[PDB]
Amino acid sequence: DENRNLVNMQGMQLTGYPATGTPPTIQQGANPAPITIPNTLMAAKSTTTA
Amino acid sequence: YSNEQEQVLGQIVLANFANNEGLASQGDNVWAATQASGVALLGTAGSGNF
């Protein structure tokens, strides 16, 4: 939906563990929350390894 | 044109919706935006979303 949640036909929001960090990962310590699939942009990254 | 030159006259726009299922059928295969579909997000063929 427009809120970037995954919703059923009644508008209820599918839940799961959020991703955190950079790179983003899923932790074992997490509270389930509405899944989001953001459209938003990525930041540009300066290279630190090659 | 017959002088062996060309002129750009315009560029067709395309639209996309967050929720196509929300669009109001107007008959034939023509549709109107609704609160359910979201606003049209515009672009051009061969760029970005299209």
Curated annotation (Swiss-Prot), chain A:
<comment type="similarity">
    <text>Belongs to the flagella basal body rod proteins family.</text>
</comment>
<protein>
    <recommendedName>
        <fullName>Flagellar hook protein FlgE</fullName>
    </recommendedName>
</protein>
